[PDB]
Design an enzyme around this catalytic site. Structure first.
Site: not given
Ligand SMILES: Cc1cc2nc3c(=O)[nH]c(=O)nc-3n(C[C@H](O)[C@H](O)[C@H](O)COP(=O)(O)O)c2cc1C
Ligand SMILES: O=C(O)/C=C/C(=O)O
Ligand SMILES: Cc1cc2nc3c(=O)[nH]c(=O)nc-3n(C[C@H](O)[C@H](O)[C@H](O)COP(=O)(O)O)c2cc1C
Ligand SMILES: O=C(O)/C=C/C(=O)O
Lengths: 312, 312
Positions: B44-45, B131, B196, B251
């Site tokens: 986790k970040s 983020c 995201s 995705g």
């Molecule tokens: C619950 C949640 C928490 C996330 N936390 C982080 C994070 O801590 N650091 C980060 O770089 N991306 C985080 N992301 C974004 C994901 O790493 C990813 O880039 C994003 O969900 C798009 O990918 P996906 O379409 O498979 O969901 C998070 C996404 C979600 C769903």
């Molecule tokens: O912890 C979060 O809010 C997600 C951060 C991210 O997408 O980098």
């Protein structure tokens, strides 16, 4: 129970209209939109001179939406101006005319000629600051200094109420800065959110190929992909521009989607991809479906719930 | 036929891993990801101090994807560093540690301490520049001068190869600039596209309410909504950063979606929303499905089709 609206000194039977670019390029298209049940129509974004647009294939639709890189194919400003001056039946519904010149000078040239027609006929200007498909021309409204320049120059040359078609933003700082730029301009009476989500890439797994030809397959996304993005932008500008109207555009396929846009703050609701795919019969369906939701909820008018989305 | 590969001086059983933030916050999560059939994992970040994150509800999933505003809830850098130095079994798979300090100074402090553990254990840094969910903190990589400052200061403080988690872009000029900024830093060996799609808004028609509590319902989008955007960004950076790796994220629900990311240029493929919803069994299914597509097409290796998306 009714879908009627009265805004910008015009009366609309219901909030639905095409999104610019869809079913609005030729006289045939505009006559079709006029004969439909939509509350209004907008013409294809135009340039001073006619344009063939980008090479084909340049639009493709899929279950979750569409991708396109049309490249502003259009019959040219003279045509759309003549349509607004001489051809449009204003007793049927109001008409918006969209322009998307490739430079501030081109836009200024066009609005100087549009102004007397707008005064006479009541045609409404939508200035497109968000075309993502012309090679070498980034979206104007992603450059806030350029955006201000365009709006300064167009306000001065046009001198009449108009609206702006905005690209989606993805950052609270950008919502804040964009809305503040718009708020500097009292002639900007409406903000349309949003244009396509720019420069997406669809790839067909069978052929291992991109699905559109222009720009190595990179094109604007619309449809189901973009609804949450569109609602966020509608609501962001509704909250930040309390003295302007916001028109919603992006991901509308049902009266429920339109209902969400209206909750978010939308006055008019524009239909792009779904209209391209379903045809103008969509307008009677969206009307029926919106009225059904309102009936179930006990809402008699659009004002009763516009911008009333609840937060937690 | 197996999906085994070597990158960044590590060997990976397959190109699959979790996306940062998903199933990776606690020792239990990290142990679970390690026991899965994923080729790697990312933590986790984290920030220097532990964080409770944003108010609940702050994640919601829907047929087409998810929205979240977690706000970087994490156990604190001391915990993730200790996991990397003392607890992770590197014989099982490689580990990436994601950091997301709220200032350049915070990131510098963390990487100075990560360095000796990277030297000893081979843990890999992913610097999160994207983020979109901490109130009042805009995505760093949407400000190119801030992005350059962060990479200058991290490169200098850390002195070891690392990667960057990028936000999605939507404008060709931005792809050009972003990639040119990244290309200034030889220590940036990989680029993860994408985080995201920031600040979307999901509204529930029945309740007339946003679905997450923080930031008036505005949150990051993932899932089926973002696949074309993800592919575009992977391909844009793959084309512009010939001397770096691109990791694809966004995705992925099937081996076919992973196949598309790899065709676009992805070396590793990260799984966020689908993993959050399906759980870690997804990795065996994704491997099976990717192998089946490769077999049907006559591909024996990833290298045979990586980045080989055809244009028209
Ligand atoms: C619950 C949640 C928490 C996330 N936390 C982080 C994070 O801590 N650091 C980060 O770089 N991306 C985080 N992301 C974004 C994901 O790493 C990813 O880039 C994003 O969900 C798009 O990918 P996906 O379409 O498979 O969901 C998070 C996404 C979600 C769903
Ligand atoms: O912890 C979060 O809010 C997600 C951060 C991210 O997408 O980098
Ligand atoms: C075929 C195609 C052509 C378009 N042409 C224009 C245009 O000329 N001017 C404009 O502002 N938007 C244009 N758009 C964008 C739409 O107006 C609309 O903003 C976008 O499609 C998002 O709405 P949707 O989700 O309903 O499709 C075009 C869209 C497509 C699908
Ligand atoms: O004609 C086009 O390429 C689309 C323009 C737009 O989305 O503004």
């Amino acid at each position: 129970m009714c879908l009627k609206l009265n805004l910008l000194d015009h009366v609309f039977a219901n909030p639905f209209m095409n999104a610019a670019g869809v079913l609005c390029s030729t006289e045939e298209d505009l006559r079709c939109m006029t004969a439909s049940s939509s509350g209004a129509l907008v013409s294809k974004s135009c340039t001073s001179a006619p344009r063939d647009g980008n090479p084909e294939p340049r639009y493709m639709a899929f279950p979750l939406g569409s991708i396109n890189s049309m490249g502003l194919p259009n019959l040219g400003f003279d045509f759309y101006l003549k349509y607004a001056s001489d051809l449009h039946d204003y007793s049927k519904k109001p008409l918006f005319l969209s322009i998307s010149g490739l430079s501030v000078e081109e836009n200024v040239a066009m609005v100087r000629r549009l102004a007397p027609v707008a005064q006479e006929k009541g045609v409404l200007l939508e200035l497109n600051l968000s075309c993502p498909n012309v090679p070498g021309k980034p979206q104007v409204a992603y450059d806030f200094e350029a955006m201000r320049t365009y709006l300064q120059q167009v306000s001065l040359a046009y001198g009449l109420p108009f609206g702006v078609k905005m690209p989606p933003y993805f950052d609270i700082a950008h919502f804040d800065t964009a809305a503040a730029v718009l708020n500097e301009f009292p002639l900007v009476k409406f903000v349309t959110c949003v244009n396509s989500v720019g420069n997406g890439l669809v790839i067909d797994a069978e052929s291992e190929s991109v699905v559109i030809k222009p720009k190595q397959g990179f094109g604007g996304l619309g449809g189901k992909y973009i609804l949450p993005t569109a609602l966020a932008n509608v609501n962001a500008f509704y909250r930040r521009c309390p003295d302007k109207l916001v028109f919603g555009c992006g991901g509308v396929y049902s009266g429920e989607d339109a209902f969400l846009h209206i909750l978010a703050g939308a006055s008019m609701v524009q239909v792009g991809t779904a209209l391209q795919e379903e045809g103008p019969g969509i307008f009677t369906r969206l009307e029926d479906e919106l009225l059904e939701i309102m009936a179930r909820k006990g809402y008699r008018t659009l004002e009763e719930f516009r911008g009333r989305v609840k937060t937690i």
